[PDB]
Amino acid sequence: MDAIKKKMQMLKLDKENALDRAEQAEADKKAAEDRSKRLEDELVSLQKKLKATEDELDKYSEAPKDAQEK
Amino acid sequence: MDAIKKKMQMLKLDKENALDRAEQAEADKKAAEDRSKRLEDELVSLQKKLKATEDELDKYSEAPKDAQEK
Amino acid sequence: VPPKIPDGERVDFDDIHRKRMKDLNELQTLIEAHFENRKKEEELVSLKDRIEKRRAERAEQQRIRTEREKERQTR
Amino acid sequence: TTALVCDNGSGLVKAGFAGDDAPRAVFPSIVGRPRHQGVMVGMGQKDSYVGDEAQSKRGILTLKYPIEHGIITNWDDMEKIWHHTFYNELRVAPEEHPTLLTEAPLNPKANREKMTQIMFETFNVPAMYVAIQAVLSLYASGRTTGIVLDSGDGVTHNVPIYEGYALPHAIMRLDLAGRDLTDYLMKILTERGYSFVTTAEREIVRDIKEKLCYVALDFENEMATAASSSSLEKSYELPDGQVITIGNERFRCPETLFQPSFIGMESAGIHETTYNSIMKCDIDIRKDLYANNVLSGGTTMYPGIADRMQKEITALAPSTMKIKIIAPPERKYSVWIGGSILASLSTFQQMWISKQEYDEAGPSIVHRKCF
Amino acid sequence: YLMKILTERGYSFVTTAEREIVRDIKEKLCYVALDFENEMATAASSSSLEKSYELPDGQVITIGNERFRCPETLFQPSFIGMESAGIHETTYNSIMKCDIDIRKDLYANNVLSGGTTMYPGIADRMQKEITALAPSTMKIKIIAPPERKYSVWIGGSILASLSTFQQMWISKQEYDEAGPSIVHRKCF
Ligand SMILES: Nc1ncnc2c1ncn2[C@@H]1O[C@H](COP(=O)(O)OP(=O)(O)O)[C@@H](O)[C@H]1O
Ligand SMILES: [Mg+2]
């Protein structure tokens, strides 16, 4: 008939809307998770640099006792 | 007829699938955003303590320099 | 000199929204028209059933009358 | 008062008052003089049947369209069509109504100037404005960006727009449209035995094209399938009986859009002129144009074109961009719906070409600020 | 651009073969206006500019103010949508990037070459534009030899005929030893 065709059109328009929203949400989620894992790597690097600076501080804290002994 | 019923049902099913997929992606995005915010808030303090360690190293290196040159 | 559009304010993506909103209204009016139309047209099937009863009775009447005329004519 | 949103088009004149959803009167734009002699006296035979009246008496007329490719080639017939549209299909005198005509891009100036001169002198309207047929189709979609491919019946043009700023250097106008597809279908039907020659039978071939033809998703596979099985052969009943069976002519007629070499045209199909029109745009608005490709016009109503075009552009475009093709169900009247929306705006109410302005600068006012 | 503005009168050239016809029209008819606005005003009132031209099959065409609008794109690249400045201002910018002591010599020895600089009346428009841009004291001179089109090739012949240049060629044995990347090396 005619109205059945209108119902068929409507039942696909909302499908297209949902698919578009799903694609947008997937892209946003992937971008956010990539940024989060990059920040995780940044935090690991910062921890490593803190450890290295603490090592250098341990060296220049060992030096003063020998210096006083000198 | 027959094909109309199953076609409409399949369209509705796929619309619901897209909706749930978008909801899941939104939840993952919220989780990633929270993780990123928490990571940054503590990474700033990590950088601050790294700078404090660096300044401590600077002074604990200035002292042995003078002591050796003393 | 090209046409420089004067200073407006709005709108977008809303009049299309309200125009597409009445799809449900259109579907309802179409389905109502279809239902009432089938209901107000199928009665002609009953009317033609009446036509069939009238033709059946007239055919019986004409068979009887033609037999009567054949009886009354062949002398 | 209310504005008259007329839309000349080429093949179907669509008109109606501003602010509605659909045009009030849609009828073919053909004017056909009778060609035989005529023996009955007092039958009340007129000298020219225009509009939808000449699609019922077409058996003894010689229909001739007054608009060839966007441009108007026969001004007297076009004036007759306009007079019919105003007085008999809408029954509103033009002395009390603004008009909003539509015109294809890159058309000759003289056509537009003559159009405004007619509207101001013969019909004597209060004020008229001429708008490009693609901006309206972009209005109707409710967008503000996007590249619109308006494949009418006369001419196919592809106007890209971003944020409301049209890009005049990226308009790609191609003269292949529905009429050439009708002629090509009428030419390939002769391969089965059916010969249509008369200008009246062109209408029958047009009906065949509308009701049966479809655009194939992949051309070679369809050509191979139609040559082995017989699941495609759809039959159609002429206006007098003698049903005909269309085989692989079904998807070969509208394939001309994507391979204009079929009718001898050099240019590339509508799948590649859109990509070229995009690539002429700046490098930073190509993603938005990729995502908001809009279809309009009558000829884009073939079943299965919104998938073939998307497949082709996805093949051409870079793999990362998302290609989306907007194909609203109200494609045919998209330009007129957009015209109604534009005429109903308050901000637009001072852009009309008022009659006193025309009296002061002549018909060349249309090229001036009031575009 | 000429093929695109011819459509404003009714003449449509689309085929890649008809691009050659439009090129011939451009070569034979177009000229560069000394002052653009005055020419646009004159061509819109009189009809002393409309020159006709016969296509390869008849049907003569009449070019109006398309004559000086096609080559005007050189001085206003905004016509074809290009952002950059015209050939009248990129020369001045190229001069101003040079050192402060050789600007007078460059001002006095501006050279034109190449085919497209053969439009009738360009050596005056360019001089007027640069004189407008440049300081009032410097003398602006534009060298426009009549053999402009083949200027590059004549110079090439002169360079190849020199004795001092005879040892700059990229000899084949050198290419065999260093590969095609030899061209970027000392033998430029
Ligand atoms: N449902 C359809 N399927 C296929 N082709 C169609 C359909 N409707 C119209 N057409 C083609 O489109 C043309 C009408 O296009 P239209 O948009 O009216 O042109 P215009 O831009 O001049 O109004 C007709 O000539 C016909 O060939
Ligand atoms: Mg149209």
DSSP string, E114-158: SGGGGSTTHHHHHHHHHHHHS-SSS---EE--TT-TTHHHHHHHH
C-alpha D340/C-alpha D15 separation (Å) is 10
Structure-token pair, residue E78: 């905004």
Which method resolved this structure? cryo-EM
Residue in D205, D301, D336, D337 to alter for ligand 1 test, most ligand atoms within 8 A of Cβ: D301
Q: Nearest chain D Cα to C7, which residue?
A: D347
The DSSP symbol for D11 reads S
Select from B51, D54, D267, A15 the least CA-distant residue to E19.
D267
Determine the straight-line distance between the first and last CA of chain D, rounded to whole angstroms.
22
Q: What is the full DSSP assignment across E19-83?
A: HHHHHHHHHHH----SSHHHHHHHHTT--SS-EEEEETTEEEEEE-THHHHSGGGGT-TTTTT--
Helices (H) and strands (E) in chain D, counts: 12, 16
Cα–chain-centroid distance for residue D86? 20
The phi, psi pair for B65, rounded to 5°, reads -60, -50
Give the dihedral of Cα atoms E19, E20, E21, E27; nearest 10 deg. Answer: 110
C-alpha D326/C-alpha B32 separation (Å) is 32
C-alpha D45/C-alpha B12 separation (Å) is 58
Q: Are D169 and E4 in contact (CB under 8 A)?
A: no
The DSSP symbol for D170 reads G
Give D100's strand partners: D129
Side chain identity, residue D215? V
Alpha carbons within 13 A on the beta-carbon side of E172: 0
Residues 6+ apart with CB under 8 A from B41: none
Over the Cα atoms of chain B, what is R_g? 30
C-alpha E80/C-alpha D276 separation (Å) is 16
Select from D289, D292, D299 the least CA-distant residue to D326.
D292
Residues in chain E: 188
The phi, psi pair for E50, rounded to 5°, reads -65, 105
Domain D178-256: which CATH class?
A: alpha beta
Q: Are D121 and D268 in contact (CB under 8 A)?
A: no
Select from A7, D327, D306 the least CA-distant residue to B8.
A7
The DSSP symbol for D370 reads -
Residue D241, H or E segment:
strand D241-246
C-alpha separations of E5 from A17, D58, E11, E70 in Å: 42, 40, 9, 8
Helix axes E87-96, E122-133, angle to 10 degrees: 50
Structure-token pair, residue A28: 């946003």
Residues in chain B: 70
Q: Which residues line ligand 1 (CB under 6 A)?
A: D 9-12, 152-154, 178, 182, 206, 209-210, 297-299, 301-302, 332
C-alpha D232/C-alpha D237 separation (Å) is 16
C-alpha separations of D108 from C61, D82, D105, E3, E12 in Å: 80, 20, 9, 13, 10
Q: Are A18 and B18 in contact (CB under 8 A)?
A: yes
Q: Are D323 and D307 in contact (CB under 8 A)?
A: no
C-alpha E1/C-alpha E73 separation (Å) is 8
Listed in sequence order, the DSSP H helices in A1-70 are: 3-69
Q: Are D214 and D254 in contact (CB under 8 A)?
A: yes
Residue B34, H or E segment:
helix B3-69
C-alpha D61/C-alpha D46 separation (Å) is 12
Residues 6+ apart with CB under 8 A from D123: D82, D83, D86, D94
C-alpha D91/C-alpha D98 separation (Å) is 15
Residues 6+ apart with CB under 8 A from D342: D100, D131, D135, D136, D139, D348
From the number of C-beta atoms within 10 Å of its C-beta (0-12, 13-18, 19+), residue D42 rates as: exposed
List chain D residues with CB under 8 Å of E8: 108-109
Residue that is written with structure tokens 């101003």 in the block: E96
Residues 6+ apart with CB under 8 A from D222: D216, D248, D251
Q: Are B39 and A36 in contact (CB under 8 A)?
A: yes
Select from A35, E44, C2 the least CA-distant residue to D351.
C2
Select from D174, D65, C60 the least CA-distant residue to C68.
C60
Residues with CB under 5 A from ligand 2 (ion): D 9, 152, 335
Residue that is written with structure tokens 């003089």 in the block: D33
C-alpha C30/C-alpha A3 separation (Å) is 5
Whether residue A3 and residue C23 make contact (CB cut-off 8 A), yes or no, is no
C-alpha B3/C-alpha D153 separation (Å) is 35
Residue that is written with structure tokens 């655009």 in the block: D215
C-alpha separations of D160 from D100, D169, D323 in Å: 22, 10, 15
Structure-token pair, residue C33: 């028209």
The phi, psi pair for E53, rounded to 5°, reads -150, 140
Residues 6+ apart with CB under 8 A from C13: D142, D143
Residues 6+ apart with CB under 8 A from B59: none
Interface contact B52, partner A, CB < 8 A: no
| Model resolution, angstroms | 3.5
Residue that is written with structure tokens 């012949």 in the block: E157
Structure-token pair, residue D236: 């159609």
CA of D17 to the centre of ligand 1 (A): 22
Over the Cα atoms of chain E, what is R_g? 22
For residue D133, give the ligand nearest its CA: 2
Structure-token pair, residue A13: 């328009």
Size of interface A-D (CB pairs under 8 A): 3
From the number of C-beta atoms within 10 Å of its C-beta (0-12, 13-18, 19+), residue D241 rates as: exposed
CA of D148 to the centre of ligand 2 (A): 12
Select from D188, D213, D105, D85 the least CA-distant residue to D152.
D105
- Please state the residue numbers annotated as binding site of E: 26, 115, 118, 149
Give the dihedral of Cα atoms E174, E180, E184, E186; nearest 10 deg. Answer: 0
From the number of C-beta atoms within 10 Å of its C-beta (0-12, 13-18, 19+), residue D10 rates as: buried
Q: What is the full DSSP assignment across D47-90?
A: S-EEGGGGGTSGGGEEEE-SBSSSSBS-HHHHHHHHHHIIIIII
Q: Are D179 and D30 in contact (CB under 8 A)?
A: no
Give nearest CA residue, ligand 1 atom 3: D210
Whether residue A23 and residue D329 make contact (CB cut-off 8 A), yes or no, is no
Q: What is the full DSSP assignment across C9-62?
A: ----SSHHHHHHHTHHHHHHHHHHHHHHHHHHHTHHHHHHHHHHHHHHHHHHHH
Structure-token pair, residue E174: 């050198």
Residues 6+ apart with CB under 8 A from D329: A9
Sign of the dihedral defined by the CA atoms of residues E12, E19, E89, E148, in that order? negative
Select from E68, E63, E92, E88 the least CA-distant residue to E77.
E88
- Beta strand D31-34 with D25-27 is unpaired
C-alpha E35/C-alpha E38 separation (Å) is 6
C-alpha E143/C-alpha E158 separation (Å) is 19
Residues 6+ apart with CB under 8 A from C8: D345, D347
Select from E8, E41, E11 the least CA-distant residue to E25.
E11
C-alpha D333/C-alpha C49 separation (Å) is 46
Q: Are E141 and E110 in contact (CB under 8 A)?
A: yes
Select from E106, E10, E81 the least CA-distant residue to D111.
E10
Q: Nearest chain D Cα to E11, which residue?
A: D108
- Beta strand D325-326 with D293-296 is parallel
Residue that is written with structure tokens 């009049």 in the block: C15
Cα–chain-centroid distance for residue A36? 1
Architecture of domain E1-73: Alpha-Beta Complex (3.90)
Residues in chain C: 75
Residues 6+ apart with CB under 8 A from A12: B11
Whether residue D370 and residue C19 make contact (CB cut-off 8 A), yes or no, is no
Q: What is the full DSSP assignment across D107-168?
A: --HHHHHHHHHHHHHTS--SEEEEEEHHHHHHHHTT-SSEEEEEE-SS-EEEEEEETTEE-G
